[PDB]
Design a protein around this nucleic acid. Structure first.
Ligand SMILES: Nc1ncnc2c1ncn2[C@@H]1O[C@H](COP(=O)(O)CP(=O)(O)OP(=O)(O)O)[C@@H](O)[C@H]1O
Ligand SMILES: [Mg+2]
Ligand SMILES: [Zn+2]
Ligand SMILES: [Zn+2]
Ligand SMILES: [Zn+2]
Lengths: 263, 97, 84, 533, 204, 61, 66, 51, 113, 133, 137
RNA sequence: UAUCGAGAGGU
């Protein structure tokens, strides 16, 4: 009975209409994609040298925000559930960065592309700093001047955005329904005329406006939910939507298990 | 009639004036002309007028208690050291003020 | 001399809010020091709770000595003072 | 050092509001609850509980800091490495951490009256602020813009009982100051309860179920909807009534309304159920004879304290899912009303010209007791203040029911007529020392005017609204009046503070005695019977 | 890092402390999926009459859409209606409102929300620089009463007005305890004849 | 006790992989002063690795 | 201080667009159009780049202290 | 130094550096040395000639 | 300083059950389920699903305090059905709807390739 | 099986105040001096002026905790379009034969005027009102 | 060089103190130097100035926003606020974290606060250019 | 874990 219509698609955003589901299911899917879909992200920074003008934890905070390839992260374990001491090769990716400015002139800009993967759970596709193109330097991290050096060792771990927003695969998620307000779920503020003063939905042409005679259908419920899922590149937009569905399922499955064990 | 300035005794005597109702907003003058029980009522009236002006309301017993303290000695005890500390209260109590 | 006879007592036959708070607290303290309790102790074992149970049954073994301004006094037992 | 002093077992931090705390609770940061302590005597009934606290130690909650022997020797649990090998003896004391439902005295300065110090039940909570139910902000005069408040921990069974049995928040709901409550429904909950109890507010079943479950005292019986067919719908008045205890009757008439209440004003409550009437500040505020006053007299302080929480939990839920806002739009009157406003101010400026003409041609009536110039300034002031009130009334009437400023004014939760007037129509005449702006330059108010100019604009009439914006002259004149307000607040606070101290010292020893008399420390009769009744 | 209790203010005398934080998905959101950094309360506005705060929000919305810093100099020809005209030409309702959705349920809010950028200030007042509690601790040599100040493990002053409050409550035991056991209680010996503290007392 | 003030790594729990210093080791339950945020946490001594001459050694140092 | 990695409000990466934004301004584009070309559609994201101030350029002038 | 009383206090102050705006204001501040004893209001008012 | 570990939102302590069911004896056939380390995400999803069942007579949930990641749900079913069973059915019902939803997205995705 | 029954002609329909409620006044087609003032939900049961409306007042729908109605059971409301349940808060036994019955349907108000013989059964604690057409 | 003092010594700008200000007539803006022909319900009303038939202006304000000092110059639209709110911000603005100097790393001050990511405000005033507020926000 | 002052601030 659930129906899907992909309006547009690309690597980092999918626009789609979702229908024949409950509002609560579309919303719980929205929340799950924002908050609980795992990704990989730097979570421990070993600073061996930092003579830049930036503070150690200033830099560490930016490092955590660098999006890393998280495609195979589902097969990867959480550090808190791994039997090893400290971190290891089965529950983390290790990245290293080393920058320096040689020369008495100019400024060296340190980019996320200088982050070099050193180990990781082979041969899983996880841990590479996301790149737009092949010529893409990525995210600016720091800047160096004569004799200033940056030498760090980073431990990346699997996590979810409930713990820290850096583990979210999304940015915004656009989300709306009932573009003509037939359900009367909002009551518009106006000075002179509400219809002239409020802009049209970008999905106004996807449903038909109410006819001037039409009586109020007090039995209609929301049923068509237009949403666009943007991502940071740690996961592709179709992956976030798919794993969102998967994650919400396991959460319900675990509840069902616990009920069938309380017997 | 209402006046600027007071002379309660002389105005009371003026033929035509209801000598049983003439009032002054100086309760010090009321005490000299009409006595301490009239001063008690006048003191309450003048305080109430202050409180009631900005629409406020204070229960009678609080203002009644204050005006009874100010008149219990038979003269007007100011709410200052010159009134309060002229009491036969202990020295430790009086020196804490 | 100073004591006022039971038949000539004129003060209120109700326990005052101040007498109640002091009686409950004082009795609570005595209970936590293992004073004999005059009611059954079930599940509620805090000293204040036991003291409140004794109060509700008129079983707190204390007397209010109410001083009058002249120094004379009426002794009232908490068994005889009316509790709301 | 003697009438007041610094004390142990005290604490202070920034305050925050919490919609999910009972009226008589205070949320206490964990770190504070681990620093403060209460010395509990060890008995057969608590020795197991208290040994557990001792094992947890001073740094883990619920824990303990000291063990006190009958001799008085304290055992410091920070430095005892064999804390598990401590055996408590009856009669010892354990200085345990502060814990849930411990009574504590809570206080915001300045402590102007007795409900500036009330006893709350501790609730230990994360984060570093003290949490208050919003309905106790009024007696404390507290808000959350940086205010801090103080907490004091009683140290014995006797002083705990004085707090819980005399000073506790619910005992303080009605104050002897004006024989009326000092706490009511405020802010979000008051704004929301008007919106929720509007005659055309309807709630579908699925939301009704959540709202019912949010009332802790709900009896579990879903009431029949006001509309059964074609769709089950409950009204806002029905769900608010869940929060009102049974046996509560209240009647109020607004503007001679009938029992048919066409305007949905007045108030009628029967057996704790709202028959008609928008529920607003006139019903759930702190006024005498309202709902809170009535439940207190009829049900006592415990039920009345739950009333705040019940009302809050239903309304705040409904408002969370309804929404409410305010924007720049709500200050904007339509072009027709602005033209009335601008015309009426223009004609008031003309009347001021006529008054200037009469006074300057010796044709002005002198008021008794007043010089010519006093009479002139008085007539000019009445004209200009009536112009502002008249322009505000036009702006007020033009605002729709949906106008967000109007909704807050109508709930009684924030704002008043003058705020609509000054934001939308006209700020009006600026006063300093009871008079229009004085000629601080020689025969003029600013070097931008000619001498001997008594017009509205010359002596501080601000014609524009805050929406339109003030001119440079108006700006300065408005800042002159505004400075005077800051000066008054800074000065007269010490004037009244000294007054209150002298009042307290005059009266501090005056007590009601067991013979009914009111006497001082000398036994002098001040009143033969308190309040004469 | 900002937390509950820290203080913030716009440039219009409109100040507040953080009451709670909500994650991205619990915030209200617009159809475009924009969520606020910060939600202040409508009751802060009508009695304070800080209309500049509202106008600043409107102009700043326009400015970030069109790519410039709006001119908010006082005493210019700029009007609210002119800024509203620009905003409407950019696809938003002209007075700054937006339809928004409750984060818990996904349902629209019955009310539209004034929404847009406003310049906010991080003030020096942070709760963890103020929080303080004292059980026991150091006293003054001369009075043996607790020392003054957070920075010295001090105790709060129970001043004369707090004394008066406890008198009004009739809490005689509590007031005695505050001012003795919780402060400078001391045992002295006096002579029953002359009443002076001239007694020489060897207790062992 | 011989492990106070000595540097430590945590091998179990929510703080796994984090550096710290033994601030107080009364018995069985230690207090490690984490490096990363300004907080000293309670942790069992079983959860710690101590630094010694050769690498991180469990509580056999 | 230096361009933030993410938009505070929505999380979209903007730390890889600072050089491209300065370049579009050298090429004579107006700020609004440059933001448009960079695909910064939500006004939360536009604020991030439009109002950032690059202070690290000032801090670098202070001759390194090692 | 020997006349620390009767001398005026607060003429020199530690330069406020909390933020850049606060430094600019501190360098442009003025003081009226009237006191705090004797309330009045007249020197505290915003006088017309302050424009 | 008094901030809790963020992992406490979703990691269940070992002595703390994900789920605890008790009766509400004030009405017949009603249970209270306390969910630990869960959100509106789970609670609102279960709630609507359950409310549309014909044999569910009451369903509601509340997050009693936003600073603590738990919620409590109240569920009553008609005499025929047992409340805990209806909850089990809602779980399996929603898991199925999401399986369908995952399939139809996969198909629609290849179609758009 | 009902307590009161009649047909009313709508004389006035006041919207004004609310977007979802209107107050209507009607007079019995069969008996003048029997007047009905009633608040109703615009969106659920839209009425216009001069509409003919059958109004029934019952104390039971039978031919304590509310539940969504089962499709199998059957009640008096199956034959009407719009049903409300309310509280009788005033039974006015006035002079001559001017009798008023005031009912609150969750704040949607009704006053029914008429004679004792037409309204004596309405002296109830609660009333349903059922409206047809 | 031809700068500010060139205007002062060429008779187009002069300095006046409080005493000399007593004897001059100042127009608020250049437009007030000449009489006009409006009725735009959005913009603010200008005083009529109908007490003198003909005004003889001696000077004109350069800009009226220069009556403000450093702190109040940070307020956007102070002409739309109740005047005490402008006083309150003038205090709080001095309590707002930013970047107090660019050399904070080489100063060892008793206390210093630096906002991680300062932004310049979307709503600014002309006077902020001279305060450097957009450069050290 | 000092004392006496001063200055700037918070509600
Ligand atoms: N100098 C002072 N002396 C004594 N008490 C003061 C004080 N300054 C502030 N207070 C206390 O703090 C209160 C001031 O509250 P504010 O937050 O300053 C204004 P308000 O009247 O509550 O709100 P507003 O900002 O909406 O006008 C006083 O009523 C008093 O309780
Ligand atoms: Mg305040
Ligand atoms: Zn591992
Ligand atoms: Zn002697
Ligand atoms: Zn963004």
């Amino acid at each position: 009975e659930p129906k899907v219509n992909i309006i547009n698609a690309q690597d980092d955003e999918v626009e789609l209409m979702l229908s024949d589901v409950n509002l609560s299911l579309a919303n719980s899917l929205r929340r799950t994609m924002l908050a609980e879909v795992p990704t990989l992200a730097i979570d421990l920074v070993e600073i061996k040298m930092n003579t830049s003008v930036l503070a150690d934890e200033f830099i560490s905070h930016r490092l955590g925000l660098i999006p890393l390839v998280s495609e195979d992260v589902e097969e990867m374990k959480y550090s808190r559930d791994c039997t090893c001491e400290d971190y290891c090769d089965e529950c983390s990716v290790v990245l290293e960065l080393s920058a320096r400015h040689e020369g008495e002139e100019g400024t060296t800009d340190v980019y996320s592309s200088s982050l070099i993967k050193v180990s990781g759970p082979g041969n899983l596709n996880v841990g590479e700093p996301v790149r737009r193109d092949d010529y893409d330097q990525g995210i600016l991290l720091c800047k160096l001047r004569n004799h200033q050096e940056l030498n760090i060792r980073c431990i990346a771990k699997k996590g979810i955005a409930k713990e820290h927003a850096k583990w979210s695969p999304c940015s915004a998620i656009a989300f709306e329904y009932d573009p003509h307000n037939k359900l009367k779920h909002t009551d518009f503020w106006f000075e002179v005329d509400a219809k002239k003063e409020w802009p049209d939905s970008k999905y106004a042409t996807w449903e038909e406006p109410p006819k001037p005679g039409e009586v109020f259908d007090y039995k209609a419920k929301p049923n068509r939910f237009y949403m666009t899922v943007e991502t940071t590149g740690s996961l592709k937009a179709n992956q976030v939507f798919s794993r969102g569905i998967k994650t919400l399922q396991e959460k319900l499955a675990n509840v069902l298990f616990e009920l069938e064990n309380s017997r | 009639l209402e006046t600027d300035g007071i002379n309660l005794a002389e105005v009371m005597a003026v033929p035509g004036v209801d000598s049983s109702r003439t009032y002054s907003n100086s309760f010090v003058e009321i005490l000299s002309v009409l006595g301490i029980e009239a001063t008690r009522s006048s003191l309450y009236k003048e305080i109430l007028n202050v409180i009631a002006f900005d629409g406020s309301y204070v229960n009678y017993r609080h203002m009644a208690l204050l005006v009874d303290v100010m008149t219990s000695r038979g003269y007007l005890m100011a709410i200052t050291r010159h009134g309060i500390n002229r009491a036969d209260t202990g020295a430790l109590m009086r020196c804490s003020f | 001399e100073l004591a006022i006879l039971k038949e000539e007592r004129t003060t209120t036959p109700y326990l005052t809010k101040y007498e109640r708070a002091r009686i409950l607290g004082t009795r609570a303290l005595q209970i936590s020091m293992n004073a004999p309790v005059l009611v059954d102790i079930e599940g509620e074992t805090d000293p204040l709770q036991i003291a409140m149970k004794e109060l509700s049954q008129r079983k707190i073994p204390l007397v209010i000595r109410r001083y009058l301004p002249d120094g004379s006094y009426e002794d009232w037992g908490c068994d005889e003072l009316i509790v709301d | 050092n003697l009438m007041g002093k610094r004390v142990d077992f005290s604490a202070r931090t920034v305050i925050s509001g919490d919609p999910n705390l009972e009226l008589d609770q205070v949320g206490v940061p964990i770190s504070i609850a681990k620093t403060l302590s209460y010395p509990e005597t060890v008995t057969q009934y608590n020795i197991h509980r208290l040994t557990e606290y001792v094992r947890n130690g001073p740094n883990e909650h619920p824990g303990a800091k000291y063990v006190i022997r009958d001799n008085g020797d304290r055992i410091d649990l920070r430095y005892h490495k064999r804390a598990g090998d401590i055996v408590l003896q009856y009669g010892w004391k354990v200085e345990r951490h502060l814990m849930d439902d411990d009574p504590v005295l809570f206080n915001r300065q300045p402590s102007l009256h007795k409900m500036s110090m009330m006893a709350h039940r501790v609730k230990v909570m994360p984060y570093s602020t003290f949490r208050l139910n919003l309905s106790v902000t009024s007696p404390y005069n507290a808000d959350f813009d940086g205010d801090e408040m103080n907490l004091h921990v009683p140290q014995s069974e006797e002083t705990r009982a004085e707090l819980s049995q005399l000073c506790a928040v619910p005992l303080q709901i009605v104050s002897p100051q004006s024989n009326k409550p000092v706490m009511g429904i405020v802010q979000d909950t008051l704004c929301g309860v008007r919106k929720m109890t509007l005659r055309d507010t309807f709630i579908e079943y699925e939301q009704v179920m959540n709202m019912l479950f949010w009332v802790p005292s709900w009896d579990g019986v879903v009431p029949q909807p006001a509309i059964l067919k074609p769709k089950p719908l409950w009204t806002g008045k029905q769900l608010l009534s869940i929060a009102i205890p049974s046996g509560i009757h209240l009647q109020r008439t607004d503007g001679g309304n009938s029992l048919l209440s066409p305007k949905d004003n007045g108030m009628l409550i029967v057996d704790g159920k709202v028959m008609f009437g928008v529920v607003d500040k006139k019903t759930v505020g702190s006024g005498g004879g309202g709902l809170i006053h009535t439940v207190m007299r009829e049900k006592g302080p415990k039920i009345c304290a739950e009333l705040f929480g019940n009302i809050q939990k239903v309304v705040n839920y409904w408002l969370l899912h309804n929404g409410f806002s305010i924007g720049i739009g709500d200050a904007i009157a339509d072009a027709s009303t602005m033209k009335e406003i601008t015309h009426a101010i223009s004609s008031a400026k003309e009347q001021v010209q006529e008054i200037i003409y009469k006074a300057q041609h010796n044709e002005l009536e002198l008021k008794p007791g007043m010089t010519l110039r006093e009479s002139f300034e008085g007539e000019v002031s009445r004209t200009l203040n009536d112009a502002r009130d008249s322009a505000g009334r036009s702006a007020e009437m033009n605002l729709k029911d949906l106008n967000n400023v109007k909704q807050m004014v109508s709930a009684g939760s924030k704002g008043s007529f003058i705020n609509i007037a000054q934001m939308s129509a006209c700020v009006g005449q600026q006063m300093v020392e009871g008079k229009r702006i004085a000629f601080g330059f020689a025969d003029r108010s600013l070097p931008h005017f000619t001498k001997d100019d008594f017009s509205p604009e010359s002596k501080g009439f601000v014609e524009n609204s805050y929406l339109r914006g003030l001119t440079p002259q108006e700006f300065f004149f408005h800042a002159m009046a505004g400075r005077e307000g800051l000066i008054d607040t800074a000065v007269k606070t010490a004037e009244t503070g000294y007054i209150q101290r002298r009042l307290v010292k005059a009266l501090e020893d005056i007590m009601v005695h067991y013979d009914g008399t009111t006497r001082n420390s000398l036994g002098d009769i001040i009143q033969f019977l308190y309040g004469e009744d | 890092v900002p937390q509950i209790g820290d203080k913030f203010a716009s440039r219009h005398g409109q100040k507040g402390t953080i009451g709670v934080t909500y994650r991205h998905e619990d915030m209200p959101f617009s159809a475009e999926g924009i969520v606020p950094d910060l939600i202040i309360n409508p009751h802060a506005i009508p009695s304070r009459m800080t209309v500049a705060h509202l106008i600043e929000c409107l102009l700043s919305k326009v400015g970030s859409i069109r790519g410039y810093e709006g001119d908010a100099t006082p005493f210019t020809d700029l009007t609210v209606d002119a800024v509203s005209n620009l905003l409407r030409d950019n696809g938003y309702q002209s007075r700054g409102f937006e339809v928004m959705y409750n984060g818990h349920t996904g349902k629209k809010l019955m009310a539209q929300v004034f929404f847009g950028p406003t310049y906010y200030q991080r003030l020096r007042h942070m709760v963890d620089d103020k929080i303080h509690a004292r059980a026991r601790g150091p006293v003054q040599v001369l009075t043996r009463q607790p020392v003054e100040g957070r920075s010295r493990d001090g105790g709060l002053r129970f001043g004369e007005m707090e004394r008066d409050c406890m008198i009004a409550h009739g809490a005689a035991g509590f007031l005695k305890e505050r001012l003795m056991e919780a402060s400078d209680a001391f045992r002295v010996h006096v002579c029953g004849i002359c009443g002076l503290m001239s007694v020489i007392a060897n207790l062992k | 006790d011989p492990t106070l003030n000595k540097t430590v790594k945590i091998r179990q729990g929510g703080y796994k992989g984090k550096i710290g210093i033994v601030k107080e080791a009364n018995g069985d339950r230690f207090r490690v002063e984490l490096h990363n945020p300004n907080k000293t946490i309670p942790i069992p001594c079983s959860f710690l690795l101590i630094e010694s001459t050769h690498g991180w050694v469990p509580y056999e140092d | 201080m230096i361009i933030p990695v993410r938009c505070f409000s929505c999380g979209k990466v903007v730390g890889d667009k600072w050089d491209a934004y300065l370049r579009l301004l050298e090429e004579g584009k107006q700020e609004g159009d440059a933001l448009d070309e960079l695909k910064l559609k939500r006004y939360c994201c536009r604020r991030m780049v439009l109002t950032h101030v690059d202070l690290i350029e000032k801090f670098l002038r202070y001759n390194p202290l090692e | 130094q020997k006349k620390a009383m009767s001398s005026r206090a607060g003429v020199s102050q530690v330069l406020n550096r909390y933020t850049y705006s606060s430094t600019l204001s501190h360098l442009r501040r003025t003081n009226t040395p009237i006191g705090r004893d004797g309330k009045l209001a007249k020197p505290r008012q915003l006088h017309n000639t302050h424009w | 300083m008094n901030a809790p570990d963020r992992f406490e939102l979703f990691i269940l302590p070992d002595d703390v059950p994900k789920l605890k069911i008790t009766p509400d004896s004030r009405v017949p056939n009603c249970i209270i389920i306390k969910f630990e380390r869960e959100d509106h995400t789970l609670a609102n999803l279960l709630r609507e699903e359950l409310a549309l069942y014909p044999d569910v007579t009451f369903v509601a949930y509340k997050v009693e305090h936003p600073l603590f990641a738990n919620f409590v749900m109240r569920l009553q079913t008609e005499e025929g059905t047992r409340p805990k069973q209806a909850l089990e059915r809602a779980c399996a019902s929603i898991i199925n709807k999401l399986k369908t939803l995952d399939h139809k997205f996969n198909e629609e995705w290849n179609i758009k390739n | 099986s009902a307590l009161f029954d009649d047909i009313f002609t709508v004389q006035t329909v006041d919207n004004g105040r609310y977007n979802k409620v209107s107050r209507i006044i009607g007079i019995s087609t069969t008996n003048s001096a029997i007047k009905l003032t009633l608040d109703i939900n615009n969106e659920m049961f839209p009425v216009s002026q001069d509409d003919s409306l059958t109004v029934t007042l019952a104390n039971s729908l039978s031919l304590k905790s509310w539940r969504p109605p089962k499709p199998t059971d059957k009640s008096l409301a199956d034959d009407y379009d719009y049903v409300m349940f309310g509280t009788v808060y005033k039974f006015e036994e006035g002079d001559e034969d001017k009798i008023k019955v005031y009912v609150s349907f969750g704040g949607l108000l009704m006053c029914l005027e008429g004679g004792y013989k037409s309204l004596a059964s309405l002296k109830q604690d609660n009333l349903y009102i059922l409206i047809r057409r | 060089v031809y700068g500010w003092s060139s205007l002062v010594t060429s008779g187009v700008i002069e300095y006046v103190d409080g005493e000399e200000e007593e004897t001059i007539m100042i127009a608020m803006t250049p437009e007030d130097l000449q009489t006009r022909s409006l009725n735009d319900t959005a913009k603010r009303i200008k005083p009529e100035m109908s007490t003198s038939s003909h005004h003889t202006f001696t000077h004109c304000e350069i800009h009226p926003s220069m009556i403000l000092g450093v702190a109040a110059s940070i307020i956007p639209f102070p002409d739309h606020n109740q005047s005490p709110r402008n006083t309150y911000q003038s205090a709080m603005g001095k309590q707002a974290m930013g970047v107090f100097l660019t050399n904070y790393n080489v100063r060892m001050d008793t206390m210093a606060n630096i906002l991680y990511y300062p932004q310049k405000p979307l709503a600014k005033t002309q006077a902020m250019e001279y305060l450097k507020f957009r450069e050290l926000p």
